[PDB]
Amino acid sequence: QTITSLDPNCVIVFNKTSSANEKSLNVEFKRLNIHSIIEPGHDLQTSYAFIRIHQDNAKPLFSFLQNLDFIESIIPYHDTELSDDLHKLISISKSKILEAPKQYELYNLSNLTNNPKQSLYFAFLQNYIKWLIPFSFFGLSIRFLSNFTYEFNSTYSLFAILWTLSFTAFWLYKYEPFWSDRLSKYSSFSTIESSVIMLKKCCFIPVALLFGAILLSFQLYCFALEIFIKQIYNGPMISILSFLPTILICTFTPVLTVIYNKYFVEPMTKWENHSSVVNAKKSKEAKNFVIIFLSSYVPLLITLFLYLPMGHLLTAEIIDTKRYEDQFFYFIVINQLIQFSMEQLSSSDMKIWSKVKSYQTDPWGATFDLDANFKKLLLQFGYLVMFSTIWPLAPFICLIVNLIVYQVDLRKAVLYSKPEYFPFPIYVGLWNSVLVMFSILGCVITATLTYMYQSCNIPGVPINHSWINIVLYAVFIEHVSVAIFFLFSSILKSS
Amino acid sequence: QTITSLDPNCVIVFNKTSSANEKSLNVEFKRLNIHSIIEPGHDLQTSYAFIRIHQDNAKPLFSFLQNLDFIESIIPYHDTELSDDLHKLISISKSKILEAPKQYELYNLSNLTNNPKQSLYFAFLQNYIKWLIPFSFFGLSIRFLSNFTYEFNSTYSLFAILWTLSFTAFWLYKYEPFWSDRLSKYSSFSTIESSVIMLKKCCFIPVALLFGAILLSFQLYCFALEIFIKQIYNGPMISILSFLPTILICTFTPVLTVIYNKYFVEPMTKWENHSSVVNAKKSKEAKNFVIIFLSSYVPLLITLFLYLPMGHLLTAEIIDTKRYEDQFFYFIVINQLIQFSMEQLSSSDMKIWSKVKSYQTDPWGATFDLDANFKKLLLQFGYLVMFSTIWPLAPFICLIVNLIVYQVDLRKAVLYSKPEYFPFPIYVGLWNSVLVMFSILGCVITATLTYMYQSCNIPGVPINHSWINIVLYAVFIEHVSVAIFFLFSSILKSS
């Protein structure tokens, strides 16, 4: 018998160190009911177990495997016909690439892959693209038909606020209920398988605040150094010194992140002692999102809320009128492009063996990480909601990047990602609250920015207002946005 | 057979105009299974039906009554043993009146009467008294031990904010879930027995805003008239003209609310066309709370936030240093006292007949109104949360009034109120959101008042700050309070 003729439904990868003992021999007798073949693993301390299971002899095998406690991992490998079906789904997906993804495609993927975790992220991306199409069209129209005042235009900002609140409410209370119903409704088997915890988690707030203060102070100092070298420093090599601010932040941020995770995030997450590992990973992601937030948006907020307004004060011991334009260009086009760029057995038996090996070793063969894929989308959303009023072409670039990212991620998560959910039944959370916070913050910042710079004294865009009126308007916009979001949430929840 | 020997468990009161037709005989024929006695009602167009039911022949009778559509009301009248037990419970309640009511008494009351609404209201009052006892002791201590600066003391204000947030969170997420579990857990029979509705309700927001603007403008005009009369008016009858402001406000508020209800609240509520009459009553109460809020809290807010600070500005075309003191005294002692003050058959057969008469006619015999009894408590809570920093004796007066009100309301709702829930099983909402709003607003107002008047230039208590810092502090306190409330809610909900 050969692996190809077997058409395995699952691989029981165990450490070959334990398979040196006859436990691997014993599990063969335990598998007297279903065919199995054992082959050496990727390394000398692993050995694959290509087995085929049905809906009948599924629960006993996993009930044994739970107590076996000598298995490295378990993968619900796709068989030949399922692999062909998913290849055909991908082939249908690649055609009409420029067109928005269609809902019925996601239903086929959810019925075939049976992965609610993938379905949730892909539904979020589909909703994002569908809502971004009208925003992209509106941005193009306001940029071209109303090119006279394409920067900080009142109508575009009203549309941005309304679109942000409506999209957040619609996703939270009209689509996410349906799609997350599949998280527990199907929940066939994730192959991975109280108040004191919340009290302990609250104790990390001062630590996050302190580290955010450290990061903010360093970034402010780096901005001061950059403005120094670019305005009032008269050295010969201007260009060479211009790289110092970028390398300084690009070397301090990873160091701060690594010390943060090594000494604060990991020990405190261990101290919390979460029941399930998924909760521990979610808590670590939530704690680590503060650094990402303060490293992604802080430079633009410093350039906009400070620098441009208060530059005239710091003349004693001419501001760049277009600094924010190129900064936003770099953070909305170049940065997203970079992120996309960096992120004796027979031939068929060897193909299956290499597929399992890629599932176990290669970075693209790792299991679908919903958190790391939601984080990039939410960061792009924050960029599109907080600063699209600067450049109305941000929705269009975001839409194009989203289409490319969707077409790449579908292929990766379907063909190469290690499966997690079996077809046969056997025995979002943080990114919603972060999305809501991003929506409110984006509405506030957009309204405040357009109040500030609609009649700004800087040519081609100081403020004809005071530091009191701006803050009062920001508070008013925050309150009105919260009220509008509450009304939308109630209206959509009643359905 | 006599009514006393019958010991009725329920009265089927039907209109005697319909009982002129032989339907009174038809229901008697249906009542061939359980004993029944029919007597003339309170008026010539009503007739009582003293009947006794058990858990067996109860559902068919009530299904007949539902199909009958000629009944006036149905009352689960207490029998002799239940009446004696409730009399004993009241007799136990009256003793230890000055002591806080005990939980086992409420457990006995809920087991005997089986009324979830009464249990909920009395649980709220019990929790309120229990939480107000330490606040009362703290107020006494700060008034007497720290009498030097008893007005607007920082420690008392911090305690007020913390106590408010903790009380709201504890009631919402530790006691209310348990007590409201009995709302549907028992739910034996209330004898009374979607997106378009929410959209239609939202259309009333501009109407409420317009009416609130009208009321606020009128109250501001009357405040200006009062300050003119008492400060810049040199007429002979200074005392007689002092009554005119109060007379004007007390005649304009009732006509304003009567036109509000007759022209706006009723037509719009009918337009929404709520399925249940309970929802209609709740919606009518919610819209009418804006007028009550603006009639109760605005004058003190006008006296504190305005008048005292800006009195010097309006000197041209000496402010009362104790105006707010006497106003708070009147609104926290006298007003609550006024509210409490203003709010051939045998002898036993006559007693039962008169009891049914009182159930059907007398105002104290009306069914227990949870909304009208929650509203008074919430208004007192709003006063105590917004303005107790002025006079630290407010918690003590509130506790005394609450104990008296509880001892009166237990007797009323137990002995005299018409019952709604049967023992045999047969086939809060607005005041929580209002409570949370009162908590946040009270924290904000207390903090702002303490900031303003701790170092006020008015003797015996202009502001050493500006109109910017005060608003900034108010916004900061609102955000901090909402964050603290969210943390408390999460901590208590995880349990």
Task: Give the DSSP H/E element, type plus range, for residue A11.
Answer: strand A10-14
Whether the CB-CB separation of A440 and A485 falls below 8 Å is answered with yes
> Which amino acid is residue B199, in one-letter code?
L
Whether the CB-CB separation of A458 and A319 falls below 8 Å is answered with yes
Closest to B336 (Cα-Cα) out of B303, B285, B374, B376? B376
Mutation to test the A interface, candidates B444, B468, B482, most A Cβ within 10 Å = B468
| CB contacts < 8 A (A, B) | 30
Q: How far apart are CA B224 and CA B222, in angstroms?
A: 5
Laid out side by side, the sheet with B36-40 consists of B36-40, B47-51, B10-14, B71-75
CA distance B406 to chain A (A): 34
Q: A3-75, which class in CATH?
A: alpha beta
CB contact under 8 A, B494 and A197: yes
Q: How many CB atoms lie within 10 A of CB A228?
A: 12
Q: Which residue has the tokens 């109460």?
A: B285
CB contact under 8 A, B198 and A491: yes
Chain discontinuities in chain B, listed by preceding residue (C to N exceeding 2.5 Å) = 193, 317, 343, 427, 461
CA distance B180 to chain A (A): 21
By a Cβ cutoff of 8 Å, what residues of chain A touch chain B? 194-195, 197-199, 202, 468, 471-472, 475, 487, 490-492, 494-495
CA distance A488 to chain B (A): 10
CA distance B204 to chain A (A): 13
Which of B202, B471, B494 is opposite residue A487, by nearest beta carbon? B202
Q: How far apart are CA B95 and CA B92, in angstroms?
A: 6
Q: How many CB atoms lie within 10 A of CB A470?
A: 17
Backbone angles phi, psi at A40, to 5 degrees: -65, 150
- A309 CB contacts (<8 Å, ≥6 apart)? A452, A462, A463
Which of B471, B472, B491 is opposite residue A195, by nearest beta carbon? B491
| Count of alpha carbons within 13 angstroms of residue B475, beta-carbon side | 16
DSSP B376-407: HHHHHHHHHHHHTTT-TTHHHHHHHHHHHHHH
Burial (CB count within 10 angstroms: exposed 0-12, middle 13-18, buried 19+), residue B430: middle
Q: How far apart are CA A233 and CA B454, in angstroms?
A: 49
Strand A71-75 to A36-40 pairing: unpaired
Task: Give the DSSP H/E element, type plus range, for residue A13.
Answer: strand A10-14
Cα separation values, A73 from A13, A62, A69, A362, Å: 6, 12, 10, 15
Q: How many CB atoms lie within 10 A of CB A145?
A: 9
Closest to A65 (Cα-Cα) out of A198, A192, A238? A192
**Three-state secondary-structure class, residue A193:** coil
Expt. technique: cryo-EM
User: Which positions in chain B touch A194 (Cβ < 8 Å)?
Assistant: 494-495
User: Which positions in chain A touch B491 (Cβ < 8 Å)?
Assistant: 195, 198-199, 202
CB contact under 8 A, A194 and B475: no
Q: Which residue of A has its CA nearest to B199?
A: A491
**Three-state secondary-structure class, residue A39:** strand
DSSP state of B49: E
User: Which positions in chain A touch B194 (Cβ < 8 Å)?
Assistant: 494-495
**Three-state secondary-structure class, residue A62:** helix
Laid out side by side, the sheet with A71-75 consists of A36-40, A47-51, A10-14, A71-75
Token reading at B314: 């309006």
Token reading at A11: 């691989």
User: Which positions in chain B touch A492 (Cβ < 8 Å)?
Assistant: 195
Mutation to test the A interface, candidates B173, B194, B195, most A Cβ within 10 Å = B195
Closest to A61 (Cα-Cα) out of A183, A191, A253, A231? A191
Which of A198, A468, A475 is opposite residue B475, by nearest beta carbon? A475
CB contact under 8 A, B198 and A472: no
Which of A198, A471, A495 is opposite residue B490, by nearest beta carbon? A198
Mutation to test the A interface, candidates B478, B492, B494, most A Cβ within 10 Å = B494
Which of A197, A202, A491 is opposite residue B487, by nearest beta carbon? A202
Token reading at A51: 């087995």
Which of A195, A197, A491 is opposite residue B199, by nearest beta carbon? A491
User: Which positions in chain B touch A494 (Cβ < 8 Å)?
Assistant: 194-195, 197-198
User: Which positions in chain B touch A195 (Cβ < 8 Å)?
Assistant: 491-492, 494-495
Closest to B212 (Cα-Cα) out of B270, B163, B264? B264
Whether the CB-CB separation of B52 and B10 falls below 8 Å is answered with yes
Token reading at A442: 């984006």
CA distance B194 to chain A (A): 6
Q: Which residue of B has its CA nearest to A487?
A: B202
Mutation to test the A interface, candidates B475, B482, B484, most A Cβ within 10 Å = B475
Q: Which residue has the tokens 């405190």?
A: A268
Strand partners, A14: A47, A71
Cα separation values, B189 from B193, B378, B420, B425, Å: 7, 28, 8, 7
Q: How far is C-alpha A110 from the chain's CA centre?
A: 20
Token reading at A280: 């521990």
Whether the CB-CB separation of B198 and B427 falls below 8 Å is answered with no
CA distance B289 to chain A (A): 19
Task: Give the DSSP H/E element, type plus range, for residue B73.
Answer: strand B71-75
Cα separation values, A418 from A76, A355, A422, Å: 8, 9, 12
Q: How many CB atoms lie within 10 A of CB A208?
A: 19
| Count of alpha carbons within 13 angstroms of residue B16, beta-carbon side | 11
Task: Give the DSSP H/E element, type plus range, for residue A24.
Answer: helix A23-30
Backbone angles phi, psi at A70, to 5 degrees: -125, 25
CB contact under 8 A, B195 and A487: no
Whether the CB-CB separation of A63 and A350 falls below 8 Å is answered with no
Chain discontinuities in chain A, listed by preceding residue (C to N exceeding 2.5 Å) = 193, 317, 343, 427, 461
By a Cβ cutoff of 8 Å, what residues of chain B touch chain A? 194-195, 197-199, 202, 468, 471-472, 475, 487, 490-492, 494-495
Which of A202, A471, A494 is opposite residue B195, by nearest beta carbon? A494
Token reading at A193: 């398988």
CA distance B448 to chain A (A): 16
Q: Which residue has the tokens 């209201």?
A: B121
Q: How many CB atoms lie within 10 A of CB B151?
A: 19
Q: How far apart are CA B122 and CA B127, in angstroms?
A: 8
Q: How many CB atoms lie within 10 A of CB B196?
A: 12
Q: How far apart are CA B284 and CA B266, in angstroms?
A: 8
Q: Which residue has the tokens 């780096």?
A: A222
CA distance B196 to chain A (A): 9
Whether the CB-CB separation of A51 and A36 falls below 8 Å is answered with yes
Which of A198, A475, A491 is opposite residue B494, by nearest beta carbon? A198
Whether the CB-CB separation of A485 and A168 falls below 8 Å is answered with yes
> Domain residues of chain B, as ranges?
3-75, 108-493
Which of A471, A487, A491 is opposite residue B195, by nearest beta carbon? A491
User: Which positions in chain A touch B469 (Cβ < 8 Å)?
Assistant: none
Q: How many CB atoms lie within 10 A of CB B104?
A: 8
Q: How far is C-alpha B66 from the chain's CA centre?
A: 32
Cα separation values, B121 from B65, B125, B169, B190, Å: 30, 6, 17, 16
Token reading at B60: 């068919």
User: Which positions in chain B touch A199 (Cβ < 8 Å)?
Assistant: 491
CB contact under 8 A, A197 and B490: no
Q: Which residue of A has its CA nearest to B476?
A: A475
Instruction: Please list the alpha-helical segments (H only) found in B318-458.
Output: 323-329, 335-342, 347-360, 370-387, 394-411, 430-453
Residue A44 sits at the vertex; the CA angle it makes with A41 and A50, to the nearest 5 degrees, is: 20
User: Which positions in chain A touch B202 (Cβ < 8 Å)?
Assistant: 487, 491
| Count of alpha carbons within 13 angstroms of residue B423, beta-carbon side | 15
Length of chain A: 495
User: Which positions in chain B touch A202 (Cβ < 8 Å)?
Assistant: 487, 491
Residue A463 sits at the vertex; the CA angle it makes with A294 and A483, to the nearest 5 degrees, is: 60
Which of B471, B487, B490 is opposite residue A472, by nearest beta carbon? B471
Whether the CB-CB separation of B80 and B7 falls below 8 Å is answered with yes
Which of B198, B487, B494 is opposite residue A490, by nearest beta carbon? B198
